[PDB]
C-alpha cells in the first residue's frame, strides 16, 4: 500500500508541475521594459524617538496614521505620538522575552507575546484610568512569532510547533486550527477584505489559508533556505517574501507561480522585514548590513538607501495614508522618514 | 501649542524620569545561562541556592556579595538562542556516577562550538561524587576508555582523564574553562561562581586599555 500511495503522490506532483509550467507564456520583466524608471528617491530623517533600554523587536502603526506601538527586550511596550514626539503610554510586561506586538483597528486594544507561549490582550480605554490586562490566551506548545487582529473579538496566531490558530476572545477558546507545516512558522499576513491569509514557515514554503472553511488552498515553493517575512500587495491577489539567503521574491495567486526576484551580487546577509507602499510602486527591505533598501517593485532595480542605523534593522512599517515610513533597529532608536 | 499641549508635555517628561532610573540598575546585573540533563542535580542546586537567598522559562534572581545575579535556566535552537546575546557565562552540569557520558560529550561539543558564543566562558560542574567514590571502591572495568592509571583503584586517576575529555572538543580557545567537583557546603559553590565571573570580566577589561 505504501508504494502505491508514494507513486500516486509523485504522479500528482508531476501533474501540478505540468499545470504550473503550462501557462508561463510571458515574463514580468518583458512587459515592464518600456516603463519610465522612478529616478532617484532620497528621504531625510524627520523625527527621532528615544527612550528604550535595549533592542527593539517589532512595531505597528494605527489607523489614524498618528500613533505607534513598540516592544523591547526590557519588558516594555510604549505607545508614541509621531507628530510631536510625545509618550502617551508605557506598559510593563510579565515575561521579558517578547517577540511581537499588534495594534487593534478600532483603537481600543493591543496584543503581546513571546517565549512564554501565551498571547496577552490589553485594554486601553477604561474608567479607572489605568491600562490593564484583559485576556491571557493559552494552548500552544512552542513560542509565538506573529499575531494580528480581525475585529474587536478575533485573533490569528502562528507558533513554532508548526501551528496556526483562530481565537475568539470573550470565551477564550480555539475555534479552528491550521496544520500542515513541517518546521517553525515565522510570519503571517492578512488580506484587506479579511477572508484569507498567508503564512511563511521556515521550510522554504509558503501557504494560503481560508479563514472560514478551515483548510489550505494553495502552496508555493522556491526559496533555498528559511523564510523570515511576508506581506500583501494592497489589492489582495499578490504577495512578496524575504528569506535568509539574500533574496526577495514576488508571487501571484491567480496564476500559482513565482513572478520576480530581487537580489544583488554584493549582498550576503539576510532579510528581516518587508513592506509595500500605497500604490505598489515601492518595496522596502530591512537587512543585516546595517541599512534599509528601497526597490521599484515592477522592474527590480534599486532606487534608494536609508542609512543611519548603527546595528541591524529589525522592523519597518508604512502608514495607512502614505505620508511616512518608520524604521526600528537594535540600537534602541526609532526613526521617521518622509 | 496652547493650554493643553503644555500639559501633554509634562506627562511625557515624567515617563522619561522612570526610564532614566531603570537604566541605572540594568547596568549592574550579571546574566548566567544554565544547562544540564541532570534534572535531580539541577533541582538540588537550585533549592540550595534558594535556601541561601532566603514551563517555558523560569528565571531566578539572587545576590552573592552585594552583586545581583540572574539565572535563566531554560525545537530549532538556533532562533531560540538569539535572545541571549548579553550573557557572561554558561553553566553546564554533568552526571558522573553512572552509560550516559558519550551523549553528554556530544551535546557539549554542539553547544560550545557555536558562532554566537565566542566571548562566553564555560563553567563545568561534575555532580554526585559520593556515589562515584562508592563505585570506584567496587571497581567496574572501563569498557573502552584508555584509563591508563589506577583502573582497579580509586577515581583519582579517572577524573584526570574525564577532565581531559571535556577539555577537548573546544575549537576556540583564549577563554578559560573552570572545573569543579561539587561539595555539600554551598559556600564553595557561591565562591566559585563569583570568582569565575570576576576573572572573566577582568580579562575583558584589560583588553580595552590595549594590553
Amino acid at each position, epitope marked *: 500500500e505504501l508504494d502505491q500511495l508514494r507513486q500516486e503522490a509523485e504522479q500528482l506532483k508531476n501533474q501540478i508541475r505540468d499545470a504550473r509550467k503550462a501557462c508561463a507564456d510571458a515574463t514580468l520583466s518583458q512587459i515592464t521594459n518600456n516603463i519610465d524608471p522612478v529616478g532617484r528617491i532620497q528621504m531625510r530623517t524627520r523625527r527621532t524617538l528615544r527612550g528604550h533600554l535595549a533592542k527593539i523587536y517589532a512595531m505597528h502603526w494605527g489607523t489614524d496614521s*498618528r*500613533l505607534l506601538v513598540s516592544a523591547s527586550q526590557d519588558g516594555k511596550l510604549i505607545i508614541w*505620538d509621531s507628530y510631536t514626539t*510625545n509618550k*502617551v503610554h508605557a506598559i510593563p510586561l510579565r515575561s521579558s522575552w517578547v517577540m511581537t506586538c499588534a495594534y487593534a483597528p478600532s483603537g481600543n486594544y493591543v496584543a503581546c507575546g513571546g517565549l512564554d507561549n501565551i498571547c496577552s490582550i490589553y485594554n486601553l480605554k477604561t*474608567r*479607572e*484610568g*489605568n491600562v490593564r490586562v484583559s485576556r491571557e490566551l493559552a494552548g500552544h506548545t512552542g513560542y509565538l512569532s506573529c499575531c494580528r487582529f480581525l475585529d474587536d473579538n478575533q485573533i490569528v496566531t502562528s507558533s513554532g510547533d508548526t501551528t496556526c490558530a483562530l481565537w475568539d476572545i470573550e470565551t477564550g477558546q480555539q475555534t479552528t486550527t491550521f496544520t500542515g507545516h513541517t518546521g517553525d512558522v515565522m510570519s503571517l499576513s492578512l488580506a484587506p477584505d479579511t477572508r484569507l491569509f498567508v503564512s511563511g514557515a521556515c521550510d522554504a514554503s509558503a501557504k494560503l489559508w481560508d479563514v472560514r472553511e478551515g483548510m489550505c488552498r494553495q502552496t508555493f515553493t522556491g526559496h533555498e533556505s528559511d523564510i523570515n517575512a511576508i506581506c500583501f500587495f494592497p489589492n489582495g491577489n499578490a504577495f512578496a517574501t524575504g528569506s535568509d539567503d539574500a533574496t526577495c521574491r514576488l508571487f501571484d495567486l491567480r496564476a500559482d507561480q513565482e513572478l520576480m526576484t530581487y537580489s544583488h551580487d554584493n549582498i550576503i546577509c539576510g532579510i528581516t522585514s518587508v513592506s509595500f507602499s500605497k500604490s505598489g510602486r515601492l518595496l522596502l527591505a530591512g537587512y543585516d548590513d546595517f541599512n534599509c533598501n528601497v526597490w521599484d517593485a515592477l522592474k527590480a532595480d534599486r532606487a534608494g538607501v536609508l542609512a543611519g542605523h548603527d546595528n541591524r534593522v529589525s522592523c519597518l512599517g508604512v502608514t495607512d495614508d502614505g505620508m511616512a515610513v518608520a524604521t526600528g533597529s537594535w540600537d534602541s532608536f526609532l526613526k521617521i522618514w518622509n | *501649542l*496652547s*493650554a*493643553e*499641549d503644555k*500639559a*501633554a508635555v*509634562e*506627562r511625557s517628561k*515624567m515617563i522619561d524620569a522612570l526610564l532614566a532610573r531603570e537604566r541605572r540598575a540594568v547596568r549592574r546585573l550579571v546574566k548566567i545561562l544554565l544547562l544540564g540533563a541532570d534534572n535531580s542535580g539541577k533541582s538540588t542546586f537550585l533549592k540550595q541556592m534558594r535556601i541561601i537567598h532566603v514551563k517555558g522559562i523560569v528565571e531566578h534572581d539572587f545576590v552573592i556579595k552585594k552583586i545581583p545575579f540572574k539565572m535563566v535556566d531554560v525545537s530549532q535552537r538556533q532562533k531560540w538562542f538569539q535572545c541571549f546575546d548579553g550573557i557572561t557565562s554558561i553553566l553546564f552540569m554533568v552526571d558522573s556516577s553512572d552509560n550516559r557520558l558519550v551523549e553528554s560529550m556530544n551535546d557539549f561539543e554542539t553547544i560550545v562550538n557555536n558562532k554566537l558564543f565566542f566571548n562566553v566562558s564555560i563553567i563545568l560542574f561534575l555532580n554526585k561524587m559520593d556515589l562515584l567514590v562508592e563505585k570506584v571502591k567496587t571497581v567496574s572495568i572501563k569498557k573502552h576508555f584508555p584509563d591508563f592509571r589506577g583502573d582497579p583503584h580509586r577515581l583519582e586517576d579517572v577524573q584526570r582523564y574525564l577532565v581531559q575529555c571535556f577539555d577537548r572538543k573546544r575549537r576556540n580557545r583564549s577563554k578559560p574553562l573552570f572545573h569543579h567537583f561539587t561539595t555539600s557546603i554551598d559556600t564553595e559553590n557561591a565562591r566559585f561562581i563569583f570568582h569565575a565571573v570576576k576573572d572573566t570580566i577582568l580579562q575583558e577589561n584589560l583588553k580595552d586599555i590595549m594590553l
Partner: single-chain antibody, 231 residues
Framework: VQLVESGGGLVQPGGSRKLSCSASGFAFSSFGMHWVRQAPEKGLEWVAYISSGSGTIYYADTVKGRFTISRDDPKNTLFLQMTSLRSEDTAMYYC??????????????WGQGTTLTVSSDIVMTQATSSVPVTPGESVSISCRSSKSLLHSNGNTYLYWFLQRPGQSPQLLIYRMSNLASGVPDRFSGSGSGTAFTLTISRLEAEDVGVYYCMQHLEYPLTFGAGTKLEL
C-alpha cells in the same frame, strides 16, 4: 470612580477654612484636579487648578493670594486652604477630575459639592434665559464669544455641560463636536468661529434643566450666564 468632599458650613468674617476631597476607585496620581464654584442662583465660576506631579499651579484673579491648593497622593486627598473670607465667598464648591493626552476627554467626572456661607479675560454670553418647550419636538441653543477659539493645530476648545434640578453637572460635548461616554446618541453640536449652537432632536423627559457653555483656550477659564428649559 467616586469623589466625596467635605468641609462646608457657616463662618464668621475673617477666619479661615480647610476643605478636603477623597477619591475612591481610580488612579488618583495620573489626574489633574480643579476646584469650581456656583453662586446661590447664578452661573458657575472657575476657582483653581493643580496638576499631576505637583508642578504647575494656577489660581484665578479675584481670590489670588488668599486661596491655596495642595494634594496628597499616598492617601488620595485634596486640600483647599482659604483665608480672609468676605461676604462674596458664599457659594457651592465642586471638585472636578481631568486628564490630558492625545484623545482624552477632560472634565469627565464631578462630585456632589459642599456649601459655604458667610454672614484680559475672554467674554462669552448666553443667548437667552428660558424657552417654552413641549415633549417630542426638537430644540437648539446658542452662545457667543469674543475671539476665535480655533487654535492653529486644528482644535476648538469649547465645552457643553448639563445640570438637572438637584444634581451635579455631566459632560455632553467636548471640543465642540464629540460625545462623552454614557450619553444618548441624540445630541449634537456645531458652530463657527465666535458663534456656537447645541442641537437636540427627539426630546425626552428628564432632559429638562440648565445648560452651560465653557471655554478652555487659555487661563483663566470663563463661563456664561446659563440657559433654561421649562417643560
Amino acid at each position: 470612580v467616586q469623589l466625596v468632599e467635605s468641609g462646608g458650613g457657616l463662618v464668621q468674617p475673617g477666619g479661615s477654612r480647610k476643605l478636603s476631597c477623597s477619591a475612591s476607585g481610580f488612579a488618583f496620581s495620573s489626574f489633574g484636579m480643579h476646584w469650581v464654584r456656583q453662586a446661590p442662583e447664578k452661573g458657575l465660576e472657575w476657582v483653581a487648578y493643580i496638576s499631576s506631579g505637583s508642578g504647575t499651579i494656577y489660581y484665578a484673579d479675584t481670590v489670588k493670594g488668599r486661596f491655596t491648593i495642595s494634594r496628597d497622593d499616598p492617601k488620595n486627598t485634596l486640600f483647599l486652604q482659604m483665608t480672609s473670607l468676605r461676604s462674596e465667598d458664599t457659594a457651592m464648591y465642586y471638585c472636578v477630575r481631568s486628564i490630558y493626552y492625545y484623545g482624552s476627554s477632560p472634565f469627565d467626572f464631578w462630585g456632589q459639592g459642599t456649601t459655604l456661607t458667610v454672614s484680559s479675560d475672554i467674554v462669552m454670553t448666553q443667548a437667552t434665559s428660558s424657552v417654552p418647550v413641549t415633549p417630542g419636538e426638537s430644540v437648539s441653543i446658542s452662545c457667543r464669544s469674543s475671539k476665535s477659539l480655533l487654535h492653529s493645530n486644528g482644535n476648538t476648545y469649547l465645552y457643553w455641560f448639563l445640570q438637572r434640578p438637584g444634581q451635579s453637572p455631566q459632560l455632553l460635548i467636548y471640543r465642540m463636536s464629540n460625545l462623552a461616554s454614557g450619553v444618548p446618541d441624540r445630541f449634537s453640536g456645531s458652530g463657527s468661529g465666535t458663534a456656537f449652537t447645541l442641537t437636540i432632536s427627539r426630546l425626552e423627559a428628564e432632559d429638562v434643566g440648565v445648560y452651560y457653555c465653557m471655554q478652555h483656550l487659555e487661563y483663566p477659564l470663563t463661563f456664561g450666564a446659563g440657559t433654561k428649559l421649562e417643560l
